[model samples]
Each structure stands twice: as C-alpha cells, then as structure tokens.
Target: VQHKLDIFLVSEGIAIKEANLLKGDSYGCTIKIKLDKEKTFKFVIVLEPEWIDEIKPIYMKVNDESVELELDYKDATKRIYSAEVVLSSDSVINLFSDVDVSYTSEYPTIKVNTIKKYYSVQNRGMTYVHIESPINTKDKSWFV
Candidate 1:
C-alpha cells in the first residue's frame, strides 16, 4: 500500500519546495510558496500498480477546512489527480471514464486565499494491512 506519491505544479503561482515518495508510512513535504503574496496551484499524484482497481482520494487542508481531491485518469500505472479552484476550485481535464459523473461530482475543490497545507492518511484496499499506509480510513474505520 506504499504509494509512490508525486506532487507537482500545474500552472503558475506555486513552487515545488519539496516532494518525495511515501517511505513506509510517512508522507511529509514542504512547498515553498507565498501564502500571503501569490495565487498559486499544484496537484498530487498517486502512482499505483496496474492491478489495483483505482487510486483513492486525498484531502486538501485549505486554511483549515478539509476538502477532498478528484480521482482523475486511469491509464496503465498512474492516477494523476488534478487540483484547482473552479469558480472557486475544480477537477481533471473534463473527460469521460464510462463510469460517469455523479460519482465524482460530490466533492468540489474549493479555492482559498491563505497558507495551504494538506493532511492525509493511508487508505488501502482488500486487506489494508499491506504496511503501505496507516489505516484509520473512512471506509474501514470499523469494518463489519
């Protein structure tokens, strides 16, 4: 369940201060961007193997409120989830997955005007105890 996570800048405004792979159960990085100066943006990528059904979601802590990200793309070995504000914030390159939209339209990425820091937890599948991430997940917080 250890995700080879990659966070990068999409448009102008933000800087890639630091980003690294999820070594063991740790996912900590620093992005050196102005919180009080510029209007920046970035995206987090979770690269999974070709066997997994799909990549899960990540929560972005804007100022303080926790907002989830859109699970975009499903090629061979990467789930490149896009991040940006719509009228305030938004999702991926508007496409079709055959699976449809209502499933992905619940969470809308919202925009904020302050320091951007994110928080995450390891959410795995099957038997989550793959040592990939620490699970206290929304799905299996208490599996019946």
Candidate 2:
C-alpha cells in the first residue's frame, strides 16, 4: 500500500487549502502548490508519530532563506505531528526524517475546523432562519 501525507496551505492567512502526498516507493517526492497570487502564506506540514523529536527547524527553508519551524501539535497516542511556518514566496517545503518510512493512504484529507451559527426569529406569525459558517477564532489565537 502507498503512504500519504497532508499539507495545509493558508494564503495570506485567509484562504486555506490542502495538499496530499502519496509515497508509494520513494523516500520523498516533490509537491506543487499554486500560491502565485500573493507574496506570503502559511503552510502546516502534518507528520506521523515517528517524526517526534526527529524533525527540527534546521531542516526547513523558505525562498532560499532559512526560517524557524514551529511545533504546532504532536499526539503520541494518535501518532500525528504537525508543524507550521510562514513563507514569502512560492517555495518548496522539504522534510527529512531519519527513518525510512512507508505509509498507506491514511493521511488526513481535511485540515480545517469550522464554527457554525444558526439563529431564528419570529415576528407577526412569521419565522425566519439565519445560518452562518465562520472560521474558528480560537484556532487563530492558539496557532499564532
């Protein structure tokens, strides 16, 4: 079976997208993302449990300039790791792990959390319903 990974890209800190990687027979493969509209964006790289203490900031770069990598979240029991960084241009993010790993198609496909709101109003024997989906503000503060 092939292994897979999920990469979440946030354009200008607003619009976020997901990139999937499938590792069939290679250690690593190149991924392409169309972040051509703006000058800066944020990317969150999701990793497996084996990456704990194995991945570091020194292994990542942005636009040929070295940038610090941040540990976003790591779950030991779940064996999932995630890190994030900001980039100023269209760039490739590389990850190097000591262990040669293979994976099944078991990566997280969706990388977004949403907050939903619904409201109802009654006036003159009439009813109105309003619903909205907004970004979770707590996630923004917690991540930054």
Candidate 3:
C-alpha cells in the first residue's frame, strides 16, 4: 500500500548535471530531467536496519509475460523498501518515475532503473532486493 522513501530511479539517457547527496547521505538517490525546466524525481527514503550478509538469488515475474532476476535477502531490513539500479537494455527509458512492481504479503522494496522508473513486487521472505545485472561492487554478493 505505502512504502518508505529509500530508492530512486535515474534515467540513463538523461544527463545528470548535478547530483546533490544532501547531508552527504547516500540513503537515497534522485533523477533530474530538464528539457525546458527542471524536475526532480525523488524516491522513498528508508534506512537499512542492518548490513546485508546473506542473500538468495531468484527469477521473479513482472505482470505476467515479463520476468526479472533479483537477489532475495535472507535477512531483509524491513517491510516495503526501495532501491535504484542502472539500466542496461538498449531501449530508451526513464527510471524512478513511477512504481511498477507490487507485492502480495506486504513485503516489497522499490527497484528503479532505465526499464522502469520504480517497481513494486512482493517478497516471500528475505532482506535485500537486488538487480541481476553485472554492475556495482556487490553484484555477486548475497546481500545488499
């Protein structure tokens, strides 16, 4: 239903002229698109209660036809969270624009990237929500 602000979607095609991590905080990210004016895409902000140490990888479905691979946290921080990911597909897109994914049992973290702005999906049981792409330092790591 409702989620805490923790994740953001950054459009790949768009230019990031300025990235202000206010208060030197990396808890959340933003996407700014400016053609004639400026608009900032802010995401839900939530803090991770603990560092991720274990993770489980799985392939999940989006809607019905679409599917995605993500790492399920064995020790999730809390219920309903969000995170930003880099888009890899060739398709032109925007990230962190809206919430696309949804969950059933009230355990989902928003995931943002180029394909979709924000995705809300259900979590059976776990800790961190992960993208299966080969980006970032802890890509292969179990937890986030």
Number of the predicted model whose lDDT against the real structure is largest? 1
Taking the candidates one at a time, how many backbone clashes does each contain?
A: 6, 1, 18
Off by over 4 Å in 2: 1-4, 12-38, 50-58, 77-90, 98-144
In candidate 3 the C-alpha lDDT for residue 23 amounts to 24
- Per-residue lDDT for 55 in model 3? 22
Clashes of 1: 6
Error of 1 at 35 (Å): 4.0
Lowest summed lDDT over 10 consecutive residues: which window, candidate 2? Answer: 122-131
Predicted candidate 3 versus true structure: per-residue lDDT over 23-105, tens digit per residue: 21112222222122233331222233233343212122222222232323324554223233232232222222123332222
* Candidate 2 per-residue lDDT over residues 1-144, each given as its tens digit: 232333334332322212223332212222223343334445554443223343322134444344565666656532223345543344554433322333212212121211121212111111011212232343342254
Candidate with maximal TM-score = 1
Candidate 1: global Cα-lDDT?
A: 0.34
lDDT of 1 by residue, 1-144 (tens): 354443444443222211223222222222223344435454443434324455343445444444456666656655555555422332222111212333323221222223454322222211122211122222121111
Summing lDDT over every window of 10 consecutive residues in candidate 1, give the lowest-scoring window: 124-133
Error of 2 at 79 (Å): 6.5
